[PDB]
Structures are given as C-alpha cells and as structure tokens.
Symmetry: D2
Subunit: 208 residues, 4 copies
C-alpha cells in the first residue's frame, strides 16, 4: 500500500504555504505497513501537471491526497468535486492567468472525489478538528491538480482513491495581514498536519 500526499509551494505573495511543510513532514512516514510519499508541487499551470503526472507514474500510489492552502477558510475543508475548467482569479507563479479554458479538452465536466469524505469529516470531528465538505475547490491550481489526479484514476486505473483537502492560513501568516485591513481565520500547523494524517488513515482503512 502506497499513499501520495502533495502540497504546494508559496504563492500570491505569501512567504510560506503550510501545505509544503505538511508534504515534507509526512514524506517517508508509515501508517501500519503503508508507505507515505510526500511531494511539493509548483503553483504553475502546465508545470504542475508535468510534475503531478511524473510523480503518479513514478510512485503509482493506491491513494492520492492533494493538499492546498485556502486563504480565508476557517476550518479544514474536504473537496467533493473537481471541475474541468481553469479561470484564475490571480495569475500563477509564472504570471499566467488562464481564463475560461478546460483542463482536459473532451474529458468529463467534473469528477467526484473518491476519498471517503464523509467518514474523514466524521473522524476529524471526533478528534476535535473542525472540518466540512467543500463543493468547490476553486478554479485555480488546487482544482487543477485535483481534476488531473481524478482523471488519471479514471483513465489509468490508479490511484484507486483521489481527493483534495484545503487548510486555512496558519497563525503566523496572519501577522502582516492585521495592519492591512482585515483579520482572516487561521488554524494551527499542528492541527492541519494531524487532519491530513487522519484523512490518510481513514482512506487506508477504507481500502479494506
């Protein structure tokens, strides 16, 4: 059993992206006899797909859990659906701001996450971790990778399960926002990391 967890590099002016640390922290760990691989993806259209594809083919994970930062969200959110579209509100890290364009021409308009999202949410709640099911992962890079991963599953037969989890800003990221006007919600790095670990455990247990 192999699990692939991905995170993203910093973007949009942020000095850090907590999901990058999550990926690195989870890399190489083992839950039971399952091997976990953690990889960081660039916040760049095209390049992110290349890295994603290469990683999936290299590792051929049974389960893929892609993690991203969701500025403004107050709790852990588990994505229900990936949409075949790109409409960036801001440009990617290379200045590309793609609008009204499919991710995979001719492919399904959308794919439902194949992670046991309701069971994951339930377990997180039992752990005292606020979490909810999100019905839109946006149309930026998080949705982009979520869709490509699910399309890979539908087209290649692996990973068996694929999904996306968004985490709020961690506290330290709020500091310089205070003087700028508003104070967005945050969640400790420790809780975000544990949330992803829990999702992996629940997904694994689901695979018989």
């Amino acid at each position: 059993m192999k699990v692939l967890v991905t995170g993203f590099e910093p973007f949009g002016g942020e000095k850090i992206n907590p999901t990058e640390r999550i990926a690195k922290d989870l890399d190489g760990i083992k839950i039971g006899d399952a091997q976990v691989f953690g990889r960081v993806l660039p916040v760049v259209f095209g390049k992110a797909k290349e890295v994603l594809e290469k990683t999936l083919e290299e590792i051929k994970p049974d389960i893929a859990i892609h993690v991203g930062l969701a500025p403004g969200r107050s709790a852990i959110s588990i994505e229900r659906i990936a949409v075949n579209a790109i409409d960036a509100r801001i440009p990617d890290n290379e200045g590309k701001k793609i609008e009204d364009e499919p991710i995979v021409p001719g492919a399904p308009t959308a794919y439902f996450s194949t992670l046991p999202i309701k069971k994951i949410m339930k377990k997180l709640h039992e752990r005292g971790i606020p979490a909810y099911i999100s019905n839109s992962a946006g149309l930026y890079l998080s949705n982009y990778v979520m869709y490509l991963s699910l399309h890979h599953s539908a087209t290649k037969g692996y990973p068996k399960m694929s999904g996306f989890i968004h985490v709020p800003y961690i506290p330290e990221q709020i500091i310089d926002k205070i003087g700028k006007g508003q104070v967005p919600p945050s969640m400790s790095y420790e809780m975000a990391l544990e949330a992803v670990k829990v999702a992996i455990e629940v997904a694994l247990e689901e695979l018989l």
Copy 2:
C-alpha cells in the same frame, strides 16, 4: 506586585468557556516576583459586579486583565474602550436581558483601557500570535466588567492598570457548529493562554 486575571463561566448554550480554564491555569503562577491570581466570574449582571468588587477589594491588584470569549472573532483582540451602557443581545445566565441602561449612573460615558495595548499587540505579533485592537467590547458582560474595573481604578486608585482581552472560540467549540450552518474561526487554547500570559508580562514590564 499582584496581578488579577479573570475569565467567565460558560454561557449562551456553550458547554465551555476557554477563559474559565485560562483563569484557573494562570492562578497562583508567578512571573518574576509578581503574584498572579486567577478568578472566574459568572455571566450574570449584578452578581458579576458583586464578585468583581469583592475580588478587587480582597486582592487589591496592581494590574487587572479581564478575559472573555468573543464568538466569531478570528484573532486575539485587546479592548481599547469600556462604555457605560448595557444592551444585551442575549440574556445573561439568569435570563436577564438588560437594554439601554447605564452601568454606573452619572459616571463617565467611557474609560480607555490603561493596559499598554499597543505594546501588548506588538509583542503578541512578535510571538506569531495574531492580535488586533478592538474598539468595542460589546455591551454584554465583558464590557460590563471592563467598565466596572476601570471605574474602580479611577475611583479607588487601584488597580493601576486595567483592561480586557477577548479570545476566539477554541477548536473543540466549533465541532457542533459545523452541522448547524456556518464555521466560525477558532484559535488553539494554548495560543489563547500564551497571549494572556504575554499581556501580563508586558503590563508588568510597563509598571517600571
């Protein structure tokens, strides 16, 4: 040197109030040679005043830092001003919903906090703790105690410094809110507790 820190009991249907734990956790500790006293106040108009007054006269603190829960706020907030008015949006723990009534008839319309609020905010930020200055502590029990404490200072000469700090919900309090409709912001109990400790340290250092 004596410091009085207060918190509140649960209210509004909540099973817990993190400030109650903060008060109990800080009771009896010492910062340098300063003695810290932690006391819990009832969320009841009148009774809260009685307890507050008795406590202040009993301990005669040099510094008073009153802490309360602020549902919905995303970061630590330091109150700038206490207003001479009661206008409860919800009733207190004994069903009393007082509206348009002064806290102390004839007394000043308001009192500015005498805690070094800007220095406290600055130190919290250096500690990676999101915090901002609030310009309204509401017109419920938090403001009620904040005003009475500052009035006591102006009238009795002690405490020399008095102020109020509001903390967000702690994560576990969000769990049953998720199914109810929305997901309010939260902040770990550990960070909330440390924030209050920092405020005490900064206040103490301020007193020469």
Copy 3:
C-alpha cells in the same frame, strides 16, 4: 422564441422568497417578440422535478433561466455548473433531508450552464449591478433544478440554453435577522428583478 423563468416558494422558515415574485412579475411579459413564461417551483425534492418536467414539456422553452434565493450572498451570482448530487444541509419543505445521492443515476457528474454567463455578468456590470460567476449552486434545490434542466436540454434537445441565477436576500428579509445575531447582505427587489430581465435579454440576443 419562448423563455421560461422559474422561481421558488418560501423555505427554511422565511416568510418570503423574492424569486417567487420575480417569476410572477416576469410571467407574460415580452422582450422584442419573445414570450416569457414565469413559474414558481416548490422547494421539495421529487415534486420539484415533476413540476419542472411538466413545465418544460408544456412550454418547450428555447431558453430556461431558473432563479433562486442564496442567503448570505452579497451580489447577483450566475451559476457556472450543475452537479449530479444531492446533499441537503437542511431538509426540503416536506422534511426530506437527502444526503449523498445522485440526481440522475448514471448521468454525467456535471453540466456547465449554457447561458452566456460571461456576457450576462458584463452587461449587469454595465448596468451598475454587482454580479459574479458562482462555481457551486449548492447541493440543495437550486442545484437540483439547475441539473435537471441542463440534463433535459442534453437529452431532449431543448431548451437550447439553460442556467441558474441566485439573488441575495432583499432588505425586508433582513429585519428579523438583526436581533438574532448577524446582519447578512441584501439587494433591492428592483435590482434583482432587473438582473433577471437583463440575463433574459442577453440570452435572447445570443440566440442569433
């Protein structure tokens, strides 16, 4: 040329649903030589489908614009996608709270709106009407009807264009919310109505 505009009856405790009035106000009007039909749908799973299907077969509209109330949203929102799933956060008007269930078993996971959403948003902006593209119409009755309408189009060949528009609460609906805790955004009934009229005009102009 025939246009069908639908709205919903009150739900979730609300005494009114502004989209019900919109449907009734637009019923029987004509834009150019196009005939507009306005119908109200029940906020009930199953029954809503029956009424929707009967209406579509009865009128056989070239364009279908389904309108709904979106509590909390601050501006007119044009739905980009309908998802093949039902996961009600609250029960429908008959107490049915369906969870994790497809709308049409075996049908596509999702359908993109076929209304010229970007052109509609652009025209609304020129009219000084705040509007944006929403990437999730929820998984309650609005999404339910949006999906069924688009599925009808894909399966029956009509309507040629189908989409969904959500409107904010109108001001009068905010009054009793004020004492309850928070003040959600609102938009005048007149602006919401005009927004729908504009969408119809833009859709019609699009059909050559």
Copy 4:
C-alpha cells in the same frame, strides 16, 4: 427648526462617496416647517474640523446628522458613541495618518449620540430598511466629526441633538471590487437616502 446634514467627499481611492450625494440631495429641502441644510466635508483631519465648526456657527442647527460611508457594512448603522481619539488605519486625503492622539485634549473620553437612535432604528425597520446600532464609528474621520459635533453641543448648547449614521457601499461601487478578490455588501442609494430622511423626521418629532 433647522437641521444640518453632512456627508463626506470621496476617499481611499474610491471615485465616489454616496454620502456626498445624500448631503447635496437633502440640501434645501423641508420636512414640515423645518429647514434642512446639506453640506459636504473634506476627508482631511484639521480641515474637516474647520469646515465643521464654521458650518455649525453659520447655521446653528437644532439637529445635526453626520453621514459617512462604512465600507463592508451590510446595513444602515446608527452610531451610539463618539470617542476622543484618532488612530487612522489609512491616511486622510492629504496623506496624514494620525495615530494615538486625542481629538480634544482634556475633553471627555467619549460622548453618547443624542439622536433618538433606538426610535430611528425602529422606524427604519418599519420602512423595511435594515439598520442596527453601531458601538464604534471607527477612529478615522467619521468618528472625528461625530465627536467634534457632540463636543460642540456640550460646550455651546447647540445643536440640541447630534449623531452619526454610516451607510454601506452603493452597488455601483462594488463593480471594480469583484475582480480584486472579494464582494462586499451594498445598499441602494435610494434606500440610504431615505434612511437619512427618516432619521431626520424621527429626530424632529423627538424635539417635541
């Protein structure tokens, strides 16, 4: 009977300030036999005080209702209190960003509005206009003028009644915000104007 209504010029990058139009629209009108004067104030510390003082001495109004724009607020808000402090989050129109400074050295920490705020809120609600009582008018120019007006009343004996009303952005102001990231609440210009007219009527009726 004379009523003075003031509004502010555009500020913070905005091309317009709806309160400027309100002031101009209400100037010269009469409610019963009461004369209404509408004047626009600059969003500049110091200069605003000069204009305010000159206007008050020139007209010597019985009632003064100062109106301002409150970006982000979702409904009409009636200010309960003016605070003797300046702490600008942004600079004024002349680049002055005053911090931690009293408005009037030695004067009271605060003044309660003398407008019949609860009756005004009640009437607005009866008119279907969402409105609530705000406990902080900020520490920028709105609070600055609110405080100076109330201080003038306490020191000069006129105006007999003085207060402040904040209005949300009007719809057209939201357009260019949409592409910038978030969609703040708005309220029609017509409703904002009527709200101020209602406040004047209620204030006048209050003066016997």
